[PDB]
Symmetry: C3
Subunit: 269 residues, 3 copies
């Protein structure tokens, strides 16, 4: 169980993560309203939320998403799209571990994820920090589903510690680095990482432990089924690096479970 | 066992379905011959079959295929291509149920399939009915394999009842809606639906029953194996909504079976 | 165990295969240097290796790769890219067996691979034989990973016997034909075929035997795990048509093992 306040955040940013897949939200003019197709992001549409920066085909690995200004909830939301393109997928397969000592000592991260972030970090940092300067009373949030959740996590770890908190909400995100990194993400100050998972979704079980990957703690595990509405009693907090009994169980993994995080994520055209 | 006449129809429209995958058959001048590559549709090539309209990347979900004039068999054939593009696959993954009350009352259909048809319905109805006016003694037939069969099934349900019969021949189609839609598809007047499945092909088992999906009746089940020629003695008619004992059995599914419907389907470049 | 010399060749042409995946190595101007990204082909960069020809989107099935001139090792290298595009994957699925009487009587090959090679044979044969005319002292080597290895194998069979030897190095290649073709590939002279597999990689198990496919002999089997460096003691020569005990074992296959042949392969952007 989680509080209703946290459940409301979990649902809101699941819809910000879903909105990043909608192609129209990746090349939109600044200042226009954020909308989705179908009921993909009704809570985002209800808010007075507008584009600060909409980007696609960026850097290496086809980094795609948007930076949003939410005057209703008082948020500065950086939302990364997950995998869709072939280029996204080639980047996912660059799963060798690379050094990221600038982020934390002895830490290593997925080559693809960290190389994609590094290729856009200078542009996006500047835009985030411009928004923070103009709206110091707003909360900065990075979010994303799947690959996007991995990018949000890395970006968050990289930019924290510059005067403003950064909270990260990742949905169905893969492991992003080694144990050193997983511990850093568990204890890092200056913002909170909400790592959300759903039943037996396969993607948070990649890359496998055997390749040297670990998961930060805690884990928020959605136990309700696919196409089943989530209530705050269906979400269980699970503490411990590489903890089992949540998504990390030795059972059969599931693909449709990857697409149901409060609603459908990843399917907006 | 089926009659030799029906078998010949099953074999001919499997090749019309196969033809829809060939890229040259999605952007051809009107009036030119329909051909395939490497024996994909020899019966279509033998016939005096020419393009009335060829489309690609239409509507939402990358709707693709062609409308054919067959003077040998006196047919107006609408052939929908199945899954090939990323856009196709994203559409398939939009599997929550949406109201299609305008097609039949109480009915709910796959969100991707129905949205893809709605986004081309006015254009293709005009093309079909123009052809009907020009050749009012020809037989209208919608056909397709996999995603194409689902579009052909939804299109026929929508466009029947406007003065002409529409026969539908689907190959390896997934379930397209709830039980009400499955019953409607079983009983609708103004044309016949031939839903054809092969051994333990996985696609006609998707989306699973547990998401609220049902199959229309009857089912024509090909019992011969992959890469094995079909004879009329290898096809069995199975009646009953959500009948078991044909493709719908609780055994291990198979992916290559999906590509063998009288011949290789889905592979024409 | 293999000799250190043969190990060095296995390592070198795995890197030539890895290089074919980098996009900039498929439209490079003739005479420019062959380079990769992410340390994909260090040994190729060290060498004085330049492009003689660079191709992409060629023939049918999106044939892609390059022809290289290696003045350090005195090589003419034809390197085919493996599967990256949708068109590549569709060609893989064209798995019915087609007669290749122009190579050997009773032989049949994977329709897709043989069609793709046929569609570029005349052009590439001319490029290779131009290079042999200019550098008759050099050694002609065809190579490729996965689909690229299947193409290198078919090409070598077709072009051998015209006065210059052609050695073939394939990495994780699928089965390319029936047993007659597999026996021909085992006894053909005019060059040697080095068919290199890794642990329980799934691709060399495809298409399955039950569709009429067989493997040529011998097999060089890499026993060292994924992300583990390979030494000459980790490679086992395995003789015998459809020999078991190497990659052809009745155990669970693995997808990430397909990407680790001395290094990461198939992942260069
Ligand atoms: C996040 O990645 C966004 C994905 C959401 C999107 C958007 C919705 C449409 C997609 C589809 C995008 C288009 C995909 C194009 C290529 C995909 C090919 C395969 C896709 C699955 C088809 C069915 C086979 C939603 C579809 C994606 C579903 C699968 C996603 C995989 C994970 C994505 C990712 O981010 O990759 C993680 C990387 O770190 C890669 O990790 C690796 O090391 C490579 C692993 C490759 C697969 C390994 C196989 C799994 C191993 C376990 C085997 C199962 C057996 C278990 C039973 C044991 C018990 C006895
Ligand atoms: C034990 C471990 C189990 C591992 C997971 C099972 C194996 C996964 C294999 C793929 C299954 C995907 C299921 C998702 C269900 C989505 C889902 O529920 O929707 C499916 C949709 O309703 C129908 O989809 C289609 O029209 C096509 C079905 C394909 C899905 C599965 C792949 C089979 C077809 C392969 C074609 C590939 C080539 C096409 C060309 C382009 C590519
Ligand atoms: C029915 C009985 C037959 C058993 C079923 C056999 C198929 C089992 C697995 C299904 C796969 C479809 C193969 C169909 C089939 O018969 O074709 C196999 C084809 O020859 C494969 O050849 C290739 O080169 C591509 C490999 C396809 C799968 C490998 C995926 C690797 C992904 C790595 C990332 C790439 C970037
Ligand atoms: C083009 C468009 O619909 N723009 C809307 C605007 O009409 C509306 O007043 C505003 C409220 O947030 O959101 C935006
Ligand atoms: C090949 C071509 O351009 N047009 C052909 C024509 O020659 C042939 O008489 C007719 C019979 O079906 O089909 C069409
Ligand atoms: C390419 O390498 C060769 C030496 O092997 C030489 O022509 C030159 O140093 C390089 N050229 C470029 C453009 O890097
Ligand atoms: C290649 C064949 C894919 C089409 C199957 C449906 O969807
Ligand atoms: C041939 O189809 C093998 C595919 C190469 C894999 C590329 C990187 C995963
Ligand atoms: Ca709004
Ligand atoms: Ca003809
Ligand atoms: Ca060099």
């Amino acid at each position: 169980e989680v509080s209703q306040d946290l459940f409301n955040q979990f649902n809101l940013f699941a819809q910000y993560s879903a909105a990043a897949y909608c192609g129209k939200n990746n090349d939109a003019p600044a200042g226009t309203n954020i909308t989705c197709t179908g009921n993909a992001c009704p809570e985002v549409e209800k808010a007075d939320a507008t584009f600060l920066y909409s980007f696609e085909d960026s850097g290496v690995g086809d980094v795609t998403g948007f930076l949003a200004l939410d005057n209703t909830n008082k948020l500065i939301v950086l939302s990364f799209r997950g995998s869709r393109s072939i280029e996204n997928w080639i980047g996912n397969l660059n799963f060798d571990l690379k050094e990221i000592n600038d982020i934390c000592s002895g830490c290593r991260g997925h080559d693809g994820f960290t190389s994609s972030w590094r290729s856009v970090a200078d542009t996006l940092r500047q835009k985030v920090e411009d928004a923070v300067r103009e709206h110091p009373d707003y909360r900065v949030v990075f979010t994303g589903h799947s690959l996007g959740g991995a990018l949000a996590t890395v970006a968050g770890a990289d930019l924290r510690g510059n005067g403003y908190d950064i909270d990260v909400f990742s949905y169905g995100a893969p492991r992003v680095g080694n144990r050193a990194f997983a511990e850093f993400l568990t204890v890092q100050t200056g913002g909170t990482l909400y790592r959300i998972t759903h039943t037996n979704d396969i993607v948070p079980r990649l890359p496998p432990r055997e390749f040297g990957y670990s998961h930060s703690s805690p884990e928020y595990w959605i136990k309700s089924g696919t196409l089943v509405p989530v209530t705050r009693n269906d979400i269980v907090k699970i503490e411990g690096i590489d903890a089992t009994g949540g998504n990390n169980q030795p059972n059969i993994p599931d693909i449709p479970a990857h697409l149901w995080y409060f609603g459908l994520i990843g399917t907006c055209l």
